[PDB]
Design a protein around this ligand. Sequence first.
Ligand SMILES: Cc1cc2nc3c(=O)[nH]c(=O)nc-3n(C[C@H](O)[C@H](O)[C@H](O)COP(=O)(O)OP(=O)(O)OC[C@H]3O[C@@H](n4cnc5c(N)ncnc54)[C@H](O)[C@@H]3O)c2cc1C
Ligand SMILES: Cc1cc2nc3c(=O)[nH]c(=O)nc-3n(C[C@H](O)[C@H](O)[C@H](O)COP(=O)(O)OP(=O)(O)OC[C@H]3O[C@@H](n4cnc5c(N)ncnc54)[C@H](O)[C@@H]3O)c2cc1C
Ligand SMILES: Cc1cc2nc3c(=O)[nH]c(=O)nc-3n(C[C@H](O)[C@H](O)[C@H](O)COP(=O)(O)OP(=O)(O)OC[C@H]3O[C@@H](n4cnc5c(N)ncnc54)[C@H](O)[C@@H]3O)c2cc1C
Ligand SMILES: Cc1cc2nc3c(=O)[nH]c(=O)nc-3n(C[C@H](O)[C@H](O)[C@H](O)COP(=O)(O)OP(=O)(O)OC[C@H]3O[C@@H](n4cnc5c(N)ncnc54)[C@H](O)[C@@H]3O)c2cc1C
Lengths: 243, 245, 245, 245
Amino acid sequence: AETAPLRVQLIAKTDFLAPPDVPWTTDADGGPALVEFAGRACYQSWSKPNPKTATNAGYLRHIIDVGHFSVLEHASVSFYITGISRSCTHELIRHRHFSYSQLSQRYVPEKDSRVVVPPGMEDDADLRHILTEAADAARATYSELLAKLEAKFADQPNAILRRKQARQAARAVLPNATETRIVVTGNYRAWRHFIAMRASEHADVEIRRLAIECLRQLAAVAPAVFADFEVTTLADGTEVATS
Amino acid sequence: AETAPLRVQLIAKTDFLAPPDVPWTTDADGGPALVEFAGRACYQSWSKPNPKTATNAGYLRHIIDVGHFSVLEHASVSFYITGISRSCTHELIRHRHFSYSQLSQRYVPEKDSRVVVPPGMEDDADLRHILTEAADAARATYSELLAKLEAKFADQPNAILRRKQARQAARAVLPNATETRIVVTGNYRAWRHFIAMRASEHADVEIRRLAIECLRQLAAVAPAVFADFEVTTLADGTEVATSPL
Amino acid sequence: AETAPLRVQLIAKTDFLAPPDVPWTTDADGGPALVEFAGRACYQSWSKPNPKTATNAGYLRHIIDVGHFSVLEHASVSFYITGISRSCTHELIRHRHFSYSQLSQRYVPEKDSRVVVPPGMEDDADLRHILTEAADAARATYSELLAKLEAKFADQPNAILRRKQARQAARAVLPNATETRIVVTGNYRAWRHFIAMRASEHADVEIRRLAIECLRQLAAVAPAVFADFEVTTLADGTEVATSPL
Amino acid sequence: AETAPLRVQLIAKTDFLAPPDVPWTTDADGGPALVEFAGRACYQSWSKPNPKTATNAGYLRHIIDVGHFSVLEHASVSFYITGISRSCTHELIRHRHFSYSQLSQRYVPEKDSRVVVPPGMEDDADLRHILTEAADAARATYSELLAKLEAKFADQPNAILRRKQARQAARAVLPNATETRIVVTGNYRAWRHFIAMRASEHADVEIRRLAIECLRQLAAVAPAVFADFEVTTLADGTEVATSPL
Ligand SMILES: Cc1cc2nc3c(=O)[nH]c(=O)nc-3n(C[C@H](O)[C@H](O)[C@H](O)COP(=O)(O)OP(=O)(O)OC[C@H]3O[C@@H](n4cnc5c(N)ncnc54)[C@H](O)[C@@H]3O)c2cc1C
Ligand SMILES: Cc1cc2nc3c(=O)[nH]c(=O)nc-3n(C[C@H](O)[C@H](O)[C@H](O)COP(=O)(O)OP(=O)(O)OC[C@H]3O[C@@H](n4cnc5c(N)ncnc54)[C@H](O)[C@@H]3O)c2cc1C
Ligand SMILES: Cc1cc2nc3c(=O)[nH]c(=O)nc-3n(C[C@H](O)[C@H](O)[C@H](O)COP(=O)(O)OP(=O)(O)OC[C@H]3O[C@@H](n4cnc5c(N)ncnc54)[C@H](O)[C@@H]3O)c2cc1C
Ligand SMILES: Cc1cc2nc3c(=O)[nH]c(=O)nc-3n(C[C@H](O)[C@H](O)[C@H](O)COP(=O)(O)OP(=O)(O)OC[C@H]3O[C@@H](n4cnc5c(N)ncnc54)[C@H](O)[C@@H]3O)c2cc1C
């Protein structure tokens, strides 16, 4: 078995086009620009009237301070995440205010599928080897089942739909550690709650790792929106994020 | 490996208590009655002038026919589902207007988990034994890894954590076919969409058989809300449920 | 001219049916029994070694304490709220994890529509008078508009269509304070977040007054789920509700 | 009364950034490009075997025909909308898969608020005048209530609170036609749904106009995504937008 490392790639974000017949500007671009525009539209306060918050960064900080998170919802970011385990995405997709598109084992052949090594095993050659040996055996069963199910279903003339009927049964044997790939789209508020929830000590370590990497890259895009999240290291080497 | 048959059990539904100061009654109770009530509340239409919508099934079929699906959201039904695979719940949970509570592999020991047999191999002792032996191996490996991770994490003084730390990693080798158990709650509208999506000929046969089973149980609770669905057989012996709506 | 008092009628709640072959019982039924079952199903733990959590209330307490809110979603309550203003419902409906069925001004005559007096002027009869009379003027204008519209639209031979087309323009003049009526269904979690946002001090007094009323009826049927909330009186003399959770 | 015309301005769309270690490219950018990527990521179908769907538009059209709407959810558009009534936005916020930031009446000066003329009376000077004169009246009655309400709360030292507390009761008398302004964000799936519901013959003409205008600006951004909707005209001379899906 080959192993797959976590890669999170930002592929989409908000293009803000400010409306001309409104008399306002701000030190920000894109999603953070839009969020300010939306909170200000709420009071038609286009003149920067509380000079404390006359910066995008200061305005956004204030919204987070008062708990008016709905304005955060206007801006969105998409990621393409590879090297994520099946079991990890099984936890991820419980978060219902995201949109998702995911590699499907019903359509995509998995005989060369890679595995994602749990973080608890990353530093142990014996454990990793046990895992990959077990994954190799599962892929061989998957190919043995695929071929026999294809024979069994030979009288289905749509070859495509046959393949699928076979594949979806044969994937029965693939382990949780099998690598998946997924596009995840979330608005700032959806992202904040996901990080709050999955970057805590309580969360499984794989999804914690993902959450923290998301925070890292989201903080690059909307520094003010995510500034209250604090990346600490724990007694056991792993990272957590908290507000 | 022991195998697990799908079992869907209705564990909750709506209990409707008509407000007694609304000059209204109908030939039904529960979810179905709430739905007629909510619809009539939109138009304050308590007296029932049209005989075609004078009964509860008549009113509901009209609600469906005219697309007023919002009113269907007030009534719900809960199910406890067992003998469902992990891969199948992994499709189920993509539906975002349901509420879910699920057996966690982080908390529940899986040394002796049952396997769920893909419907396409249910009737074939050979394929089943290939899957069951591969699962037996995967659990054996699971157990090996667990003892080792518990050793590896022995310096974690909270034994509850420790086992959690071990289990959540050991489970890496557990297969898609591993049984899970889940409680799923949806309002009627959520269920209709679930049936439409996952009871079609394009869905995996496992989720599809779940869809059809929930449908048939929901149809017993609320015949008028689900009646537009027709269960129908395929070239290959499997079923679909579809609606012209 | 006729003023509307807040009235809130519990019209629906959860009916629970424990599945037979699961060795667990509890000192509860309905919603709060469902929620315990949901939570236990996660750990497949049906026993009661701990007197803290050996009852429904203590178990529900604990689920709330650790913040496993998901389990609260399985159980629902529906109210029929009459005597709430249009502007108020316009705030209510921003809560997106509720389901709604509302009296439409497009279909229901508003000739004799009642108004809801803002609570910040309930006592001062002077201000009341300036409201009631401003509304009578708006009702008169709506009836004038409706008549002219119906007559303008006389060649729409479909009489229900004419009326709809006429009322939906005529209602332009009806004030914010006009009564509406509305069924609202939320799961225990939705309610908890509503009560928590709209029963605070920072919330408008009319919606606050709805929240606390919802709270007290939710406590009558699911006490442990909502026990952590406390109604206190503010400097104003108006009630608010809070919990440190 | 000033009378505001509907105005819809596209203030946000999606910026797409192809990931360079994926062997794929397409004849498009932004939203439409993200959606294809999301669809192809599902099957890892990066090379493009079929010529019929080898273009961005051919691919998107095929996503719609097959009903895979999940994938439309990755891209969104935000609008700032003015010249929309309160009655209209009160219909609009029934849509729960949208994000809203609306001008508040508890906080913003309604002393000289503009009014929106219902489309049903737009072309009749007699009816418009009735509306705008009822409006003028109403804004007169609102001052009476405001200035007198601040006075009943002289005892409260917090000024900006005191103002808020007086408006919140004073807007009771403001009418449904009163202009509001709102930022509305949704993904392509959510837009399609709004258009299907509110561009229909059954919807109020004011929201219908809004929906057709949004349809127009969305169709420019992402033509393949909105191509199934045709705008036709009913016998009464009002527009509808319908799709066969
Ligand atoms: C200690 C702990 C243990 C847990 N154990 C388990 C377990 O064993 N098994 C299991 O299946 N789950 C368990 N959960 C829940 C699980 O971890 C999921 O992550 C969680 O249910 C999904 O995230 P979320 O609840 O915040 O909902 P999300 O889908 O992420 O929703 C985000 C926000 O939207 C709102 N929302 C979304 N849908 C609804 C709804 N329909 N009704 C009301 N509000 C809604 C909520 O307010 C929520 O804050 C546990 C949670 C905790 C804290
Ligand atoms: C032929 C086909 C192939 C597919 N292939 C794949 C695939 O390979 N990989 C993959 O990941 N998915 C695939 N999908 C989508 C997938 O199968 C899921 O069933 C679907 O994503 C979940 O159901 P739903 O999208 O209707 O969402 P649900 O959550 O069940 O939606 C319920 C309703 O709520 C609304 N809704 C919920 N959330 C939103 C939101 N964020 N924005 C707007 N509306 C919302 C929608 O209108 C929807 O009808 C495919 C779909 C089809 C039809
Ligand atoms: C101090 C303050 C001032 C405000 N001022 C204004 C104003 O001027 N104008 C205005 O229009 N609004 C304003 N709001 C917002 C408004 O008051 C509403 O209460 C709010 O928009 C709706 O309630 P909710 O945010 O709890 O979302 P709800 O619909 O009640 O949903 C509750 C839960 O579901 C989640 N959820 C639902 N949809 C999404 C989504 N798409 N993305 C992520 N999570 C989601 C939320 O995260 C939350 O966890 C203000 C709020 C505050 C606190
Ligand atoms: C002919 C007709 C008459 C109507 N009359 C009235 C009336 O008099 N009074 C009134 O209040 N309403 C009435 N409605 C409903 C109303 O017009 C609103 O537009 C509608 O309630 C909001 O749009 P939506 O229902 O698609 O929900 P949206 O919030 O737009 O949802 C979009 C999608 O998400 C899904 N979704 C969102 N929330 C849930 C949920 N909780 N459960 C399951 N799925 C969900 C749905 O599947 C839906 O397809 C009427 C509708 C029709 C067709």
